[PDB]
Amino acid sequence: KKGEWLPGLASPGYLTGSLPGDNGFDPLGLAEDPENLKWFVQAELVNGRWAMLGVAGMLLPEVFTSIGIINVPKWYDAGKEEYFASSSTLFVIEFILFHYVEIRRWQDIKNPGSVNQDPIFKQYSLPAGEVGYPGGIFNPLNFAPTLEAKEKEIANGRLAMLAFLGFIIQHNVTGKGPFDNLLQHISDPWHNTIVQTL
Amino acid sequence: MRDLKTYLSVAPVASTLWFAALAGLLIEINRFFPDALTFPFF
Amino acid sequence: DIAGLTPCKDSKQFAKREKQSIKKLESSLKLYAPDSAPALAINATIEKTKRRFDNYGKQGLLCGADGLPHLIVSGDQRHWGEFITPGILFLYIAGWIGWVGRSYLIAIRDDKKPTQKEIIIDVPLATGLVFRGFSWPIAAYRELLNGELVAKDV
Amino acid sequence: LNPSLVISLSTGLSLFLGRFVFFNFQRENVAKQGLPEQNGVTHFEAGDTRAKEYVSLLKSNDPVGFNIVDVLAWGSIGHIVAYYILATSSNGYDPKF
Amino acid sequence: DWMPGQPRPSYLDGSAPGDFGFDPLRLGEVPENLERFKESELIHCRWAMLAVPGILVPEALGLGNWVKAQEWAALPGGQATYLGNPVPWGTLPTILVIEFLSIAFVEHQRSMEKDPEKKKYPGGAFDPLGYSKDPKKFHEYKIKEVKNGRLALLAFVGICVQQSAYPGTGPLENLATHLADPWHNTIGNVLIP
């Protein structure tokens, strides 16, 4: 009993249960190969983490704007705004920095523990952790990376990924932002539904 | 009964049912969206 | 515009084809009564003709000297709906078909008589495999990196 | 502008290069290249009566072996380069920057 | 190591000057090719270490960029100008035949001598001050040369690509354009036109 995504269906054999957030969910069998499972675990972590930050940066500035405390552009209109640098320059900065960071993380995915030390400063290295959970400077508050804690990270990532999937599709058909959709729905849910929007 | 279901799974009958369902679907798609030389939704 | 073509909203031959087509249908309409069923059928065909011509002119289709929509498949971003976008949709569907059929052949290749499940379809096995093509570009790509897509030394 | 000047300078420099500069490289490359052969043996040995190379014409009292054929080859280079230079100077062709 | 985490190739031990383990396509799979490449790399490195100073130094003066400093030969009656003075042999046929004879002779001397370490590091008359005296500082200078050369090669690629992104410009002129506004005049504007 590790949690059943479908109470009737049995859990696949290759999903042992030693992984956080395991509920026996893989109908299409994409992670039958343990190497595919190992790669997709990192893909879920990074996609979930980016979705968590994205959903926060999309929802929280907008609700604070609609309340009246701040006046921050909406997440879809924040790109058209004017900034201190050309958007093209911002792109190149982000590309170069991620072309360094993501490949350093990728070297750990292929070969674990191969990029734990700073190449500039020979000292100040990372302690030995697990793939997807780098210790050292990446955990300053020295929290305990354990079950539940890792299970809550994956659970919040899954809900945030569904939240991002909701935000983009809503904004496409509704025209406005997520918090404006919630206010429109809260005013009259029986007459302000996806049924009424289409 | 089991023999009847085994007959329905033979290649021509499965092909007819599959192609009939496929033909009906494409007919309704071209019925609600006739003509269309392009993908207009961009 | 491109290749000397003019957009169909600007072409006179395009509008003359719409006129002559509608007037030809109207010439067939005068023979029947206004409450007749052939009349409502011809009227529906006329409305369907107006809808077709208007949709072609609205979505930026280019017209030649003949007043007929010409398609540009060079990749110009103004006309991706004419080939590249429906082509990606096709490649998604085609890969789905091939990947599901391949999954079926792999699953029955270890049967006692593999030919038995090829002339008599195992519908339960098929229904369980038809939805693996939804993620076919992923499952195929992983099988490419893991050496599972191609048989070694053939 | 003078045909004798261009032809003499071009042919003189061509013969000079082929004798003193591009000579050892040409001879070592023609040695490792060898004589053309059919069925693993030379054209003459196979039975072509007219495929015997004329070593008498290749005889030269020159200290390095420069014979008549070397003069003909590098001289043809000099004259072709000379007439190329002359023909390119008289056409008056000019591109546009 | 040029990429920590990646295993080194089999033939790149780490002894050769500049051996950081870079051969993804395995072009140096054959020792004959690898030794020939070791010579050819130093030749490109040294041509670039002579080119980059000669490309950007006349620009600091009144002379134009390296692309316009090779322009008199396009028009018929061209006349070269070293340091603003029209040199008498400025005609293109003169310089073309001069460069052919001299460059072909000297560069072909490199072909006729195969050691094949003389093809890489000859010395003798080319080392009068004798920096090859100590076989440790000489190899250290080998590392200094290959890194200086690779730096100049990457700079020559930058000069040419910038010249493409701004036809008829100077490398230092592009530097001044970047100094006017580094956040609005970056490659992003030619990467995203």
Ligand code: CLA
């Ligand atoms: C033509 C110049 C040249 C040549 C002949 C070499 C040759 C060599 N290099 Mg070197 N290198 C060069 C340029 C060159 N390099 C430049 C410019 C850099 C800076 C980026 C480096 C950085 C470098 C490192 C860090 C290392 C080497 C190493 C080596 C040795 C092993 C690699 C090998 O065998 O591949 C042979 C190479 C070739 C056959 C050249 C192929 C050229 C291709 C066809 C075109 C290149 C495409 C290019 C990216 C286009 C960009 C243009 C721009 C407009 C986009 C070898 C002797 C490794 C070594 O162990 O040293 C001993 C090593 O670790 N190189």
Ligand code: CLA
């Ligand atoms: C910073 C770049 C650099 C470095 C570190 C080296 C290093 C080395 N070279 Mg090398 N070389 C270079 C550039 C460089 N070279 C260039 C650009 C050329 C022209 C193509 C050559 C051509 C060359 C040859 C033919 C030979 C060497 C040799 C050597 C080795 C021993 C000799 C020595 O140490 O000289 C010492 C280097 C210096 C003291 C550098 C100081 C010189 C200043 C900084 C020059 C700056 C002025 C200006 C920019 C250039 C104008 C000079 C020009 C007129 C020549 C050594 C490992 C010899 C060898 O292999 O040994 C067996 C050998 O035969 N070099």
Ligand SMILES: CC(/C=C/C=C(C)/C=C/[C@@]12O[C@]1(C)C[C@@H](O)CC2(C)C)=C\C=C\C=C(C)\C=C\C=C(C)\C=C\[C@@]12O[C@]1(C)C[C@@H](O)CC2(C)C
């Ligand atoms: C990364 C991500 C979102 C990131 C968003 C970001 C950075 C947003 C950034 C910005 O907004 C800010 C903050 C501020 C704005 O001004 C600017 C932008 C730029 C807009 C979403 C991922 C979203 C990821 C999602 C939704 C993933 C869903 C995957 C699912 C559901 C898979 C399920 C199954 O695969 C299994 C597990 C088993 C199989 O057998 C069956 C199926 C069903 C196939």
Ligand SMILES: CC1=C(/C=C/C(C)=C/C=C/C(C)=C\C=C\C=C(C)\C=C\C=C(C)\C=C\C2=C(C)CCCC2(C)C)C(C)(C)CCC1
């Ligand atoms: C862009 C574009 C274009 C171009 C194009 C080109 C020119 C390209 C290409 C291409 C190519 C040249 C490709 C390739 C291929 C190769 C190979 C080598 C293959 C493969 C395949 C496979 C391997 C498959 C598999 C599978 C799947 C996955 C699905 C199902 C099943 C199967 C098994 C079938 C044009 C202009 C026209 C138009 C517009 C767009």
Ligand SMILES: CC1=C(/C=C/C(C)=C/C=CC(/C)=C/C=C\C=C(C)/C=C/C=C(C)/C=C/C2=C(C)CCCC2(C)C)C(C)(C)CCC1
């Ligand atoms: C004695 C002696 C000497 C001298 C020598 C001499 C001087 C010689 C020579 C020589 C020569 C000087 C030769 C030449 C030449 C050759 C040839 C072989 C030729 C040719 C030509 C041609 C081939 C042409 C062609 C053409 C025509 C026909 C027309 C058109 C144009 C052209 C040009 C293409 C010395 C002292 C030094 C040394 C010792 C000995």
